[PDB]
Every structure is written in structure tokens, then in C-alpha cells.
Amino acid sequence: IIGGEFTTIENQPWFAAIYRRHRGGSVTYVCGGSLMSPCWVISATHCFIDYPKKEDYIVYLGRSRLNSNTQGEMKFEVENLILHKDYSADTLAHHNDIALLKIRSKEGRCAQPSRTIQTICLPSMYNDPQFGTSCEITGFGKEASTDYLYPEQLKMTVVKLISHRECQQPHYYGSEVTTKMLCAADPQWKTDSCQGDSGGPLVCSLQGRMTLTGIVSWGRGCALKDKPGVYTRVSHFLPWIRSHTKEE
């Protein structure tokens, strides 16, 4: 995140950290994600696209730091990895960039409720906040687009939702942005999501609840003028999510 503040997981208890193991001894961070129900995490498909081998990923919940432990964290394996059929990427945008990860603990359980682990709410069918609403993004992604490392402490920032008319202007992203995407930026283009923030949540309050309104998907550069961050519009994928999720 460019700008923002450093925080702890108590402030985003539904944020999940996804890492990948390497036949060498190192685990590296991949993308962020959010807990929907005890056993399901939602992220972005482009994070798995190049290496869809579930057995090599690890998911941690209750994590405030990237490579150091946090007391209260939980580690899970990916029992199921569901990528979107129709996922496409062009010279900028990713389409249907949403993925589901069913998690299992080494003891056979899903996430347990704590002060550092909670689920986030889903919107109702195609229901979104209006442009102008301030939403928060969180993640361990880059703090400057030129850096080549990720921060060790979690960060969060607040951005505002902008309309499709503003984002589809020729000097923004033209028709690369579709009705299944949402754009969010800072009025003064000072803070934004960036590389390493993919898959994590864009949370806004809807009808009283903190709702997962978007998933970090793409953007041209980070915190660039007239180059908003584009997110997957969760309210438009509810049927898809439903057809794959079940029980507790």
C-alpha cells in the first residue's frame, strides 16, 4: 500500500495471508485474501494462475507481520483451490479475477473465532455503496512501486469509490474497466493498493455492515494520477461464490 498507516490484524481480523513453499526451504508471500466463512477464503485468480498446485500454498489467519509470527495465528493448507473459469488477462486488466480457497488445519478444522480472526460480510446481489464512499484496503504489498521487498508490518489506507463513468474516461482506463469491476482512488492520488496487495479486500460499510465490496485486482503503476486501482466487483459474483461454498 502506498501511504496508509501500519496496523495489526485486530483491525482487519478477516485478512488472510497466502504464501507458497519452495523445494529449497523458503516460503514467500503470494497474495492477500479474506475469510468469508470458517473454511473459505476468497482472493484473486491471477495470484494462482501461474502455479495452480494447491499443496504448495500455506494460508495464515491472525497475522500482523509477514515473516515473523503473531500470537494467535492459525496455519492452514488449501484443501480446495477454485479459480474462475473465464478468467482472462489483457494488456492491463484481469477479468473474473476471483478465487476461493477452502482451508484445512493439520488437525482437520477450519478457522476458529478470536480477537484476531473474524469473517467479513458479503454484499447482497449487485448491491454496492455509491461512488464517493470511503472504503479501506489492507495488505503487505509494496510501499513504493520501485521497491523489490514487502513491508514486515501490515498496512491499511482509505480510498474512495469512483463511478464507472470517471474510470472509463479515455485518460483513465477506457473500456478496459467493465461493469464487473470497481475503481477506487484517493482524490489527491496520494495512497493506493500496489503489487503484493492483490487478492486482498476493499471493505466498505453497506447497510450497516463492513462488507467486502472489492478484491484488489490491477492498476497501472501505484498511486498514479488518473490511474485508479481496479477491484473485482464482488456483488456481481455472488451466484458463482454460492455455487461453490457450503456448510460451516
Binding site: 482487519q12 466463512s37 480477537r115 473474524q118 460480510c121 455492515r209 463492513m210
Partner: peptide
């Protein structure tokens, strides 16, 4: 206790 979506404690 139990999950209450969207709640920070």
C-alpha cells in the same frame, strides 16, 4: 465466541 461477520473487537 462465534463469528459475527464484519466485527472488529
Amino acid at each position: 465466541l462465534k463469528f459475527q461477520c464484519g466485527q472488529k473487537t
